[PDB]
Design a protein around this motif. Sequence first.
Motif, PDB file in Angstrom:
ATOM      1  N   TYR B  27       0.842  -1.192   0.000  1.00 13.67           N
ATOM      2  CA  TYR B  27       0.000   0.000   0.000  1.00 13.67           C
ATOM      3  C   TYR B  27       0.875   1.238   0.000  1.00 13.67           C
ATOM      4  CZ  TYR B  27      -4.091   2.855   0.942  1.00 13.67           C
ATOM      5  OH  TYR B  27      -5.104   3.776   0.861  1.00 13.67           O
ATOM      6  N   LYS B  28       0.688   2.095  -0.996  1.00 10.72           N
ATOM      7  CA  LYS B  28       1.499   3.287  -1.166  1.00 10.72           C
ATOM      8  C   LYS B  28       0.600   4.514  -1.149  1.00 10.72           C
ATOM      9  CE  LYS B  28       5.001   5.770  -1.926  1.00 10.72           C
ATOM     10  NZ  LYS B  28       4.202   6.386  -0.834  1.00 10.72           N
ATOM     11  N   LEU B  29       1.140   5.626  -0.672  1.00  7.10           N
ATOM     12  CA  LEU B  29       0.378   6.857  -0.619  1.00  7.10           C
ATOM     13  C   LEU B  29       0.998   7.908  -1.529  1.00  7.10           C
ATOM     14  CD1 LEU B  29      -0.865   7.594   2.973  1.00  7.10           C
ATOM     15  CD2 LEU B  29      -2.004   6.591   1.021  1.00  7.10           C
ATOM     16  N   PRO B  30       0.178   8.732  -2.172  1.00  6.63           N
ATOM     17  CA  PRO B  30       0.717   9.784  -3.030  1.00  6.63           C
ATOM     18  C   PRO B  30       1.486  10.810  -2.219  1.00  6.63           C
ATOM     19  CG  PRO B  30      -1.593   9.387  -3.489  1.00  6.63           C
ATOM     20  CD  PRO B  30      -1.288   8.697  -2.211  1.00  6.63           C
ATOM     21  N   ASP B  31       2.326  11.568  -2.922  1.00  8.70           N
ATOM     22  CA  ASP B  31       3.096  12.615  -2.263  1.00  8.70           C
ATOM     23  C   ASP B  31       2.170  13.678  -1.693  1.00  8.70           C
ATOM     24  OD1 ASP B  31       6.070  14.510  -2.941  1.00  8.70           O
ATOM     25  OD2 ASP B  31       4.238  15.340  -2.100  1.00  8.70           O
ATOM     26  N   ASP B  32       1.274  14.205  -2.516  1.00  5.55           N
ATOM     27  CA  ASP B  32       0.326  15.232  -2.098  1.00  5.55           C
ATOM     28  C   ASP B  32      -0.978  14.537  -1.732  1.00  5.55           C
ATOM     29  OD1 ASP B  32      -1.395  15.759  -4.947  1.00  5.55           O
ATOM     30  OD2 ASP B  32       0.647  14.991  -5.133  1.00  5.55           O
ATOM     31  N   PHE B  33      -1.186  14.324  -0.443  1.00  4.93           N
ATOM     32  CA  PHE B  33      -2.339  13.584   0.035  1.00  4.93           C
ATOM     33  C   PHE B  33      -2.986  14.406   1.134  1.00  4.93           C
ATOM     34  CE2 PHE B  33      -3.221  10.933   3.808  1.00  4.93           C
ATOM     35  CZ  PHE B  33      -4.477  10.518   3.458  1.00  4.93           C
ATOM     36  N   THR B  34      -4.315  14.480   1.121  1.00  5.35           N
ATOM     37  CA  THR B  34      -5.037  15.380   2.006  1.00  5.35           C
ATOM     38  C   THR B  34      -5.861  14.684   3.076  1.00  5.35           C
ATOM     39  OG1 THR B  34      -6.914  15.482   0.492  1.00  5.35           O
ATOM     40  CG2 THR B  34      -5.152  17.066   0.186  1.00  5.35           C
ATOM     41  N   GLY B  35      -6.333  13.470   2.824  1.00  6.64           N
ATOM     42  CA  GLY B  35      -7.178  12.780   3.777  1.00  6.64           C
ATOM     43  C   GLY B  35      -6.519  12.513   5.114  1.00  6.64           C
ATOM     44  N   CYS B  36      -7.255  11.898   6.030  1.00  3.23           N
ATOM     45  CA  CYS B  36      -6.831  11.705   7.405  1.00  3.23           C
ATOM     46  C   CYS B  36      -6.573  10.218   7.621  1.00  3.23           C
ATOM     47  CB  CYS B  36      -7.927  12.207   8.340  1.00  3.23           C
ATOM     48  SG  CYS B  36      -7.860  13.988   8.649  1.00  3.23           S
ATOM     49  N   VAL B  37      -5.705   9.877   8.572  1.00  5.62           N
ATOM     50  CA  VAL B  37      -5.353   8.480   8.819  1.00  5.62           C
ATOM     51  C   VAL B  37      -5.635   8.123  10.273  1.00  5.62           C
ATOM     52  CG1 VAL B  37      -2.926   8.731   9.460  1.00  5.62           C
ATOM     53  CG2 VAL B  37      -3.688   6.693   8.310  1.00  5.62           C
ATOM     54  N   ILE B  38      -6.253   6.958  10.482  1.00  7.88           N
ATOM     55  CA  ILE B  38      -6.757   6.524  11.780  1.00  7.88           C
ATOM     56  C   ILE B  38      -6.197   5.139  12.069  1.00  7.88           C
ATOM     57  CG2 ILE B  38      -8.811   6.205  13.192  1.00  7.88           C
ATOM     58  CD1 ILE B  38      -8.335   8.995  11.872  1.00  7.88           C
ATOM     59  N   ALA B  39      -6.039   4.808  13.351  1.00  6.16           N
ATOM     60  CA  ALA B  39      -5.686   3.443  13.729  1.00  6.16           C
ATOM     61  C   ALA B  39      -6.088   3.188  15.172  1.00  6.16           C
ATOM     62  CB  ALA B  39      -4.194   3.168  13.550  1.00  6.16           C
ATOM     63  N   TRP B  40      -6.234   1.907  15.507  1.00  4.13           N
ATOM     64  CA  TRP B  40      -6.462   1.506  16.889  1.00  4.13           C
ATOM     65  C   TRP B  40      -6.096   0.037  17.033  1.00  4.13           C
ATOM     66  CZ3 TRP B  40      -9.912   2.452  13.199  1.00  4.13           C
ATOM     67  CH2 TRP B  40     -10.820   1.444  12.871  1.00  4.13           C
ATOM     68  N   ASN B  41      -6.076  -0.428  18.278  1.00  3.36           N
ATOM     69  CA  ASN B  41      -5.593  -1.758  18.625  1.00  3.36           C
ATOM     70  C   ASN B  41      -6.732  -2.766  18.632  1.00  3.36           C
ATOM     71  OD1 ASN B  41      -4.320  -4.004  20.476  1.00  3.36           O
ATOM     72  ND2 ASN B  41      -2.668  -2.602  19.919  1.00  3.36           N
ATOM     73  N   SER B  42      -6.495  -3.926  18.024  1.00  4.40           N
ATOM     74  CA  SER B  42      -7.488  -4.989  17.949  1.00  4.40           C
ATOM     75  C   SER B  42      -6.952  -6.318  18.468  1.00  4.40           C
ATOM     76  CB  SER B  42      -7.983  -5.157  16.516  1.00  4.40           C
ATOM     77  OG  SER B  42      -7.126  -6.022  15.796  1.00  4.40           O
ATOM     78  N   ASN B  43      -6.093  -6.283  19.489  1.00  3.24           N
ATOM     79  CA  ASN B  43      -5.520  -7.521  20.009  1.00  3.24           C
ATOM     80  C   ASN B  43      -6.594  -8.446  20.558  1.00  3.24           C
ATOM     81  OD1 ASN B  43      -3.537  -9.375  20.801  1.00  3.24           O
ATOM     82  ND2 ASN B  43      -2.165  -7.725  21.452  1.00  3.24           N
ATOM     83  N   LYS B  44      -7.447  -7.927  21.437  1.00  2.00           N
ATOM     84  CA  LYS B  44      -8.420  -8.765  22.124  1.00  2.00           C
ATOM     85  C   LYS B  44      -9.454  -9.326  21.161  1.00  2.00           C
ATOM     86  CE  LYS B  44      -8.727  -5.186  24.168  1.00  2.00           C
ATOM     87  NZ  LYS B  44      -7.931  -4.743  22.989  1.00  2.00           N
ATOM     88  N   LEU B  45      -9.731  -8.610  20.080  1.00  3.02           N
ATOM     89  CA  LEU B  45     -10.759  -9.004  19.134  1.00  3.02           C
ATOM     90  C   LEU B  45     -10.180  -9.753  17.943  1.00  3.02           C
ATOM     91  CD1 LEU B  45     -13.455  -8.738  17.397  1.00  3.02           C
ATOM     92  CD2 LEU B  45     -13.041  -6.272  17.368  1.00  3.02           C
ATOM     93  N   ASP B  46      -8.863  -9.809  17.819  1.00  4.56           N
ATOM     94  CA  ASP B  46      -8.268 -10.373  16.614  1.00  4.56           C
ATOM     95  C   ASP B  46      -7.235 -11.465  16.848  1.00  4.56           C
ATOM     96  OD1 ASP B  46      -6.355  -9.996  13.945  1.00  4.56           O
ATOM     97  OD2 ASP B  46      -8.485  -9.595  13.596  1.00  4.56           O
ATOM     98  N   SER B  47      -6.451 -11.430  17.919  1.00  9.78           N
ATOM     99  CA  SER B  47      -5.433 -12.451  18.117  1.00  9.78           C
ATOM    100  C   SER B  47      -6.006 -13.643  18.870  1.00  9.78           C
ATOM    101  CB  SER B  47      -4.237 -11.885  18.875  1.00  9.78           C
ATOM    102  OG  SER B  47      -3.118 -12.745  18.752  1.00  9.78           O
ATOM    103  N   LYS B  48      -5.635 -14.839  18.432  1.00 15.44           N
ATOM    104  CA  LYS B  48      -6.118 -16.055  19.064  1.00 15.44           C
ATOM    105  C   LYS B  48      -5.189 -17.226  18.786  1.00 15.44           C
ATOM    106  CE  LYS B  48      -8.953 -17.056  15.090  1.00 15.44           C
ATOM    107  NZ  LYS B  48      -7.691 -16.864  14.346  1.00 15.44           N
TER     108      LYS B  48
END
Lengths: 48, 48
Positions: B27-48
């Motif tokens: 996944y690559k992002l353009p040089d001139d990019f305006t949108g916003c980027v979000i993230a959060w942790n999903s250990n309890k809901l995803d690792s097993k």
Amino acid sequence: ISSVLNDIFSRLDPPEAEVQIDRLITGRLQSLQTYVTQQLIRAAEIRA
Amino acid sequence: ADSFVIRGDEVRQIAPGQTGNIADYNYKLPDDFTGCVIAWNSNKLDSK
């Protein structure tokens, strides 16, 4: 940080590289502008 | 909008003008990019 455009581009990330590019470009433009102004002034006494 | 899940210490590598395995090859992002980027942790809901 440096006086070589391609060095700036390789070493930095695009925003910060843009900042350096603008710094160098403004400096060079202003220097050339001073040259032209002095030359214009000199031409007037030559014409007199 | 785009959504996916990464291994966790590549979160800083998402940003524009950065290099590495994930942001180089999937996944690559353009040089001139305006949108916003979000993230959060999903250990309890995803690792097993």
